[PDB]
C-alpha cells in the first residue's frame, strides 16, 4: 500500500512499502545494556535497557556496601545495538504528479544496517510506529501530533555449470556476438569488438590497465546510438551521456565538496 | 488626451483605441481568441513617452503603474510561500502602463509570452501548477541600450528585445526627438515659465 | 485565582435537550426512520465514520416546531456562534443514543473493546465489595457541520483578508487557492498508559498542540495500595486522529491594489483529511479559532469542503457516422486554418504505435519555419485535446522545468527528488514552444527520452534515472525573425540535425506572402470573427471531451502485423531509398523506416484493426513524404 495512504489505524501494524532511499545518517549506537559501577566498592553490575530508560540501580547491589546513590554509569562498558535511520521517498512513478512525493524514516537495525544505499529502489517491511517529540530537551512536555516511522524487520532490492556448458561451441565468438543486440542489424565487426570490450584484458601492477576503448563513427543516420544503448544496459556499472557542450568537469567531477561525474 | 504634446496626433488616436478596445471572442468548445489590444512605444528619451504614460493612466480606470506576469514569492518573515500577481494579472480587463520596458529581465519576458498570446499567465512550481487570468490591454515604452536610437536599425537592433517578442504588441510606434524649431522654441519657453 | 462570572441569554441543558430531540425526530419530510438515527445505525455497523450535520437540517426541524408552535431556540444561530462547543454537545447525544450495532464485526478484534471490557470485569470484582472511561477513546465517529444553502452568514463564502477577529467562534466559509498541503500526522486523542506495577491502566485526553505525559499511576488499584507505580505510553491503546494543515491564499484577483495577498492555516482532522490539494480553489467551511501563540495564533478547523472543479457505447455515435480519421483530425483546433495533413499527423501521435520486447513505441513530430501562422495555439490545443498531455517551451516552464534535479524546498529545510515536464509526460505527450531556443541540458533531456525514454539524475550521492516514456510534438521557429524560402533549415534553425533525424516526421512550413492563399487564409480568419461559430462547414467538429473517447478507445487497440505490409513496407522503405539515392537530410534510415511503421500502427489503431493493412502504409508513407517534400523547401 501506498506511502501516502498510511493512516492511523496502521500505528501498530506491520506493513510494506515500495521506495527510494534519498539518503542514510551513519550508523547510530544504541545502548541495549547499560553497565554501572559502584563508586564506593568497585562492585559491577549490568541494566537491560526497557524501552529506552535506564533502570539504575538506587543502592549498591553488594549488602555488605548497600550505599545510596554510589552507582555510576561506565559508558563504554555499555553494550550497544547498532541503528541507522534512512529517509525513503515516494516513487515520482506512483505520485499523483501535480505535487510532490512523499517521504518517511525508517529504522533499521543490527547487521540490517547498510543494506541499502542512496538511489536504490527497495521494499522495507516493518512495523509502523509512532513517537511522540519534545516541546523542549529541557522539559517533559510533548506536541501532540506524534513522528513516524517503519522499523523494518525485512529488506530487498526494487551457475557454472551451464557457463562450461557453452565454453565448448564452435561458433560461440559469433554466438556471443550476435546477442549483445539481435534486434539491431548484425555489423558483426562492431558487436565481436563490443564483445572483447566487455571481456577486456588483464593488469600488472609494477601505468597499464586491462582496458578496451572504441569509438563508433559513421554517419549521424545511423543505429550506433541504438548499439550504445544496449551495452549500456549490458554492462555491470556503465554510464551513458553525450558530448556535444560537455564541461571538462561535468564530464569528471565538480565543485564545500567535490563530487564524481558520469566518467567517474 | 496629453494637450501638452507637439505633433503625435497618430499615437494619441491608437491609445485611443486601446482605451477602446476590442471584443473577446471565445469561439465553440469555448475555444479562446484575444480581443485586447497591445502597444509599444519604442524610440529616444526625452520624447513624449513618459508623459504620454501619465496621461493614459490618469485618463484610465483599472490602470496599473509600472517602471510582471506573476510569481511565487517568499519575504523575511514568512516560513511560507505565496502566490503573487504582476501588473497584468492585476489589470485583468483592465490596462497595464510598461516605462521602461526596455530593462526587463529574463523570466519576466519568457513568460510575457502567455500574457501576449494566451491573456493568462501558468505556474509552474511548489505545487501550484495553475493558470491565471491576465486578460489586459498593454501599453508599453522603452529606450535605446546603447546611444541615441539608431532610426535606420530596427527595434530588435536598437533595444535588446527579441522580434519574436517586439512582434507581439499589435503596434509599434518609434518616436524621436526631432530637432524642429518651432517645437523647440513652444517647449523652450514652457519649460521657462516653469 | 478568583474569577468573575457574568450571566448570559443561553443554556447548554436547555440546548443538549434541543439537539437530542433533533436527533431522534428528524427527517428530510420534504423529499416524501429519521436520517440521524438511521445513519447512526450504519455508523455502529462500523459502515461509516464520517457524520455530517447539515444546518439545512436544522434549520427544517426549527421551522417544523415553530410551525408546531414551540420556539426551537434558533438552534442554528447558536452552532453559527459557537460552533466548537456544539460539536462537544452533538457528539454526547449521539453517545447517549446510538443503536446498537446490525451487522457482525468480530468485535473482540478492537483492542478497545478488550481493554475496556477487562476494566468492566475489573471494576465488577471490585463492585462486589471484596465514566469507565472518557467518552473520545471510544467515539470512532468524527463529527463535522456542513453550512446553510442559499436561502445566514455559514453561507457567504468569505475572502481571507474579511476574516476579522470578531468571527473567532463562529461556523464560517471562507474562499481561496490553497498555496501549501502539510503530510498526514497523527495526533492523540486519548492517550492510553499501561501501569507496570499493577496492569491498570489509565488514560488522558489531549486538547492543545501540546501536553506533559503521566508519571504516577493515579489509578485507585495503585493510589490506595499507595503503590507508586510507573506509567508507560502504549501507541496500540492510544486513540490517534488523522490531522493535517493547509495553507490558505486569497484569489490574486481579491488582492486589492498594492497589498500582500493575505492566508491562513486551515486544519483538518479524521477522515476529512486529504480532501485539498495545492492548486486548488476552493470553500472551506469551518471553524475560525484561536491558537496560543496578548495576540492569538489563529487557525480554521475544517468542516466541510466544496473544490470549484457508457463510454464504450458512446464511441459507436461517431463510429457508425464513418470516415472519422479525416473527420476527427479535421476537429482539432478548426479555428486553425488548413494544414490538414499535419493535424492527420498530430492525431496519430496521440493514438500511438506498439511497443514490444526494446522496441520503441513513441511517435514524434516537429514543426519548423517561420513564426506565426496559428503554431503555438496549436501545440495549446493538442495539450488541450490530448490525455496525458503538457504544454512547455523550450526556455519557459521555469520553476521546475523541462529538465528534472534534485531539489530543496528551501521555505524549509527538507530535500527532496521531483520530476520535470518529461515525467510528467510520461505515458503520454510533450510539447515543447520555442523548441529552437532550449539549452544544452535540455537538449540532453529529450535525447535521453528518444534514447532511454528516461530523465537521469547523477547528484548529491543519488544516481537514477527516471521514466519518460513520451511523444514529442515541438516547434522549430527560426533564427532571425524569418526562414530564407529556397535554403536548406540548417542555414535558418539553432538545432542540430542529430536531433531532428530522431523525430518521426518534420513539417517545414513558410509564411509565404502570395494574395490567392493570403486571402484564402484570410478569408477562413475574418470567416472565424464574422460568424462565431462553425469554422467551417463539413469539418463536422467533434468536442474535446467527446473525441477523447475515441482516442482513448482507439489507443487500445493494439495491431498484430500481416504478411501483406511486412512486404510493402520493406518496398516502401526501398521506393524512398530511389530519392535517397543523392538534396537536403529528409534521408531514408531506420528511423523513417520505423515511423513508417509506428505511424502504420497508429493508423491500425485508428481503423480498430488488429492486421495492419498496406493502406496504413501507403498513408504513413504519404505523410512521410508530405513531410519530406516540406522539408525540401
Ligand atoms: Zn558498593
Ligand atoms: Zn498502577
Redo the contacts between chains.
Keep these: 500500500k501506498g506511502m ?1 495512504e ?3 489505524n496502521d ?2 501494524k506491520l506493513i510494506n512499502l515500495k521506495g ?1 532511499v ?2 542514510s545518517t551513519p550508523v547510530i549506537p544504541d545502548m541495549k545494556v547499560a553497565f554501572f559501577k559502584c563508586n564506593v566498592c568497585d562492585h559491577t553490575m549490568a541494566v537491560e535497557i526497557d ?1 529506552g530508560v535506564i533502570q539504575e540501580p538506587a543502592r549498591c547491589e553488594r549488602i555488605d556496601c548497600n550505599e545510596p546513590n554510589s552507582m555510576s554509569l561506565i559508558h563504554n562498558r555499555c553494550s550497544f545495538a547498532d541503528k541507522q535511520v534512512i529517509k525513503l ?1 515516494e516513487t ?2 506512483f505520485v ?8 518517511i524514516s525508517l529504522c533499521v537495525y543490527d547487521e540490517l544496517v547498510d543494506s541499502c544505499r ?2 536504490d529502489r527497495i521494499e522495507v517491511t516493518g512495523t509502523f ?2 513517537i ?1 517529540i519534545r ?1 523542549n530537551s529541557r ?10 516511522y517503519v522499523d523494518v524487520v525485512h529488506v530487498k532490492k526494487v551457475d557454472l555449470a551451464k557457463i562450461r556448458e557453452v565454453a565448448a561451441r564452435e561458433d560461440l565468438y559469433s554466438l556471443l556476438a550476435r546477442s549483445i543486440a539481435p ?1 539491431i ?1 548484425e555489423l558483426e565487426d562492431v558487436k565481436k569488438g563490443i564483445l572483447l570490450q566487455l571481456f577486456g584484458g588483464t593488469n600488472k601492477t609494477f601505468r597499464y590497465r586491462g582496458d578496451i576503448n572504441i569509438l563508433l563513427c559513421g554517419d ?4 550506433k ?1 541504438q548499439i550504445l ?1 544496449y551495452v549500456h544496459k549490458i554492462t555491470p556499472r556503465g554510464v ?3 558530448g ?2 560537455s564541461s571538462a568537469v561535468g564530464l569528471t567531477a565538480y565543485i564545500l565538496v567535490l ?1 564524481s ?2 566518467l567517474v | 488626451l496629453a494637450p501638452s504634446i507637439y505633433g503625435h496626433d497618430h499615437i494619441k488616436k491608437a491609445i485611443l483605441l486601446m482605451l477602446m478596445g476590442g471584443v473577446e471572442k471565445n469561439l465553440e468548445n469555448g475555444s479562446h481568441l484575444r480581443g485586447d489590444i497591445n502597444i509599444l512605444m519604442v524610440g529616444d528619451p526625452s520624447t513624449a513617452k513618459s508623459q504620454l504614460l501619465r496621461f493614459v493612466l490618469n485618463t484610465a480606470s483599472l490602470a496599473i503603474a509600472t517602471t510582471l506576469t506573476a510569481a511565487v514569492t517568499t519575504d523575511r518573515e514568512t516560513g511560507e510561500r505565496r502566490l503573487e500577481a504582476g501588473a497584468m494579472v492585476l489589470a485583468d480587463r483592465g490596462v497595464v502602463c510598461i516605462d521602461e520596458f526596455d530593462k526587463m529581465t529574463d523570466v519576466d519576458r519568457v513568460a510575457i509570452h502567455e500574457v501576449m498570446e494566451q491573456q493568462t499567465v501558468t505556474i509552474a512550481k511548489a505545487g501550484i501548477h495553475t493558470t491565471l487570468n491576465a486578460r489586459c490591454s498593454v501599453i508599453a515604452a522603452a529606450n535605446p541600450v546603447f546611444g541615441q536610437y539608431d532610426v535606420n536599425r530596427d527595434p530588435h537592433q536598437n533595444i535588446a528585445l527579441p522580434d519574436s517578442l517586439l512582434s507581439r504588441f499589435d503596434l509599434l510606434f518609434v518616436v524621436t526627438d526631432d530637432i524642429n524649431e518651432i517645437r523647440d522654441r513652444s517647449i523652450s519657453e514652457h519649460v521657462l515659465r516653469t | 485565582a478568583a474569577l468573575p462570572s457574568i450571566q448570559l441569554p443561553v443554556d447548554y441543558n436547555n440546548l443538549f435537550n434541543e439537539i437530542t430531540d433533533f436527533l431522534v425526530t428528524f427527517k428530510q419530510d420534504t423529499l416524501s426512520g429519521p436520517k440521524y438515527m438511521a445513519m447512526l445505525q450504519k455508523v455502529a455497523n462500523r459502515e461509516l465514520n464520517s457524520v455530517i450535520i447539515d444546518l439545512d437540517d436544522i434549520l427544517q426541524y426549527q421551522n417544523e416546531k415553530f410551525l408546531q408552535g414551540t420556539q426551537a431556540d434558533d438552534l442554528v444561530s447558536a452552532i453559527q456562534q459557537n460552533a466548537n462547543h456544539f460539536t462537544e454537545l452533538f457528539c454526547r447525544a449521539i453517545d447517549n443514543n446510538m443503536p446498537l450495532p446490525t451487522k457482525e464485526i468480530d468485535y473482540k478484534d478492537d483492542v478497545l473493546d478488550v481493554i475496556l471490557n477487562q476494566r468492566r470485569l475489573r471494576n465488577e470484582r471490585m463492585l462486589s465489595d471484596r465514566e469507565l472511561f472518557p467518552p473520545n477513546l471510544t467515539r470512532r465517529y468524527f463529527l463535522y457541520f456542513k453550512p446553510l444553502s442559499q436561502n445566514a452568514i455559514s453561507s457567504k463564502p468569505l475572502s481571507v483578508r474579511q476574516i476579522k477577529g470578531d468571527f473567532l467562534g463562529q461556523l464560517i466559509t471562507v474562499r481561496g487557492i490553497i498555496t501549501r498541503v502539510s503530510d498526514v500526522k497523527p495526533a492523540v486523542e486519548v492517550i492510553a498508559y499501561t501501569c507496570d506495577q499493577c496492569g491498570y491502566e489509565v488514560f488522558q485526553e489531549v486538547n492543545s498542540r501540546t501536553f506533559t505525559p503521566l508519571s504516577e499511576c493515579t489509578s485507585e488499584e495503585c493510589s490506595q495500595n499507595q503503590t507508586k507505580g510507573q506509567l508507560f505510553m502504549s501507541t496500540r491503546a492510544s486513540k490517534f486522529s488523522a490531522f493535517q494543515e493547509c495553507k490558505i491564499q486569497e484569489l490574486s484577483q481579491q488582492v486589492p491594489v498594492g497589498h500582500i495577498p493575505r492566508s491562513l492555516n486551515i486544519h483538518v482532522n479524521g477522515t476529512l483529511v486529504r480532501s485539498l490539494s495545492p492548486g486548488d480553489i476552493v470553500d472551506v467551511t469551518g471553524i475560525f479559532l484561536p491558537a496560543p501563540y496578548l495576540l492569538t495564533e489563529t487557525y480554521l478547523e475544517a468542516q466541510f469542503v466544496r473544490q470549484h472543479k457508457d463510454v464504450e457505447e458512446r464511441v459507436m455515435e461517431l463510429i457508425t457516422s464513418g470516415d472519422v480519421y479525416n473527420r476527427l483530425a479535421k476537429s482539432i483546433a478548426p479555428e486553425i486554418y488548413g494544414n490538414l495533413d499535419v493535424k492527420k499527423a498530430l492525431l496519430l501521435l496521440l493514438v500511438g504505435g506498439v511497443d514490444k520486447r526494446k522496441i520503441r513505441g513513441d511517435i514524434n513530430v516537429c514543426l519548423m519555419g517561420d513564426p506565426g501562422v496559428a503554431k503555438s495555439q496549436l501545440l495549446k490545443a493538442i495539450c488541450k485535446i490530448s490525455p496525458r498531455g503538457v504544454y512547455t517551451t523550450g526556455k519557459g516552464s521555469s520553476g521546475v522545468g523541462l529538465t528534472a534535479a534534485v531539489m530543496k524546498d528551501p521555505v524549509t529545510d527538507e530535500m527532496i527528488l521531483e520530476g520535470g515536464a518529461l515525467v510528467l509526460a510520461d505515458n503520454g505527450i510533450c510539447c515543447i514552444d520555442e523548441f529552437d531556443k532550449m539549452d544544452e541540458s535540455d537538449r540532453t533531456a529529450i535525447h535521453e527520452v528518444m534514447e532511454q525514454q528516461t530523465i537521469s539524475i547523477s547528484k548529491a550521492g543519488i544516481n537514477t534515472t527516471l521514466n519518460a516514456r513520451t511523444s514529442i510534438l515541438a516547434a522549430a521557429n527560426p533564427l532571425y525573425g524569418r526562414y530564407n524560402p529556397r535554403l536548406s533549415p540548417l542555414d535558418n534553425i539553432n538545432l542540430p540535425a542529430a536531433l531532428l533525424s530522431r523525430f518521426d516526421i518534420l513539417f517545414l512550413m513558410l509564411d509565404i506572402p502570395s494574395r490567392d492563399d493570403d486571402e484564402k487564409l484570410a478569408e477562413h480568419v475574418t470567416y472565424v470573427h464574422m460568424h462565431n461559430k462553425q469554422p467551417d462547414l463539413d469539418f463536422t467538429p467533434v468536442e474535446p471531451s467527446k473525441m477523447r473517447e475515441y482516442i482513448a478507445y482507439a489507443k487500445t487497440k493494439r495491431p498484430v502485423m500481416s504478411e501483406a505490409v511486412n512486404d510493402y513496407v520493406v518496398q516502401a522503405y526501398i521506393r524512398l531509398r530511389q530519392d535517397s539515392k543523392r538534396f537536403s537530410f529528409g534521408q531514408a534510415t531506420p528511423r523513417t523506416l520505423l515511423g513508417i511503421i509506428r505511424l502504420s500502427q497508429a493508423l491500425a489503431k485508428l481503423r480498430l484493426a488488429d492486421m495492419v493493412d498496406i493502406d496504413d502504409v501507403e498513408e504513413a508513407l504519404r505523410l512521410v513524404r508530405v513531410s519530406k517534400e516540406s522539408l525540401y523547401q
Excluded: F, W
Aim: charged share 25%.
Design positions: 501516502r498510511l493512516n492511523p500505528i501498530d527510494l534519498l539518503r524501552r521517498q515520482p512513478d499523483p504528479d501535480g505535487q510532490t512525493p512523499h517521504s542512496a538511489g510506529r509512532s511522540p516541546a522539559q517533559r512536555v510533548l506536541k501532540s501530533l506524534y513522528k513516524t534486434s542489424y549521424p543516420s545511423t543505429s546510438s544503448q551513458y551521456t553525450s556535444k557542450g563530487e561525474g558520469a
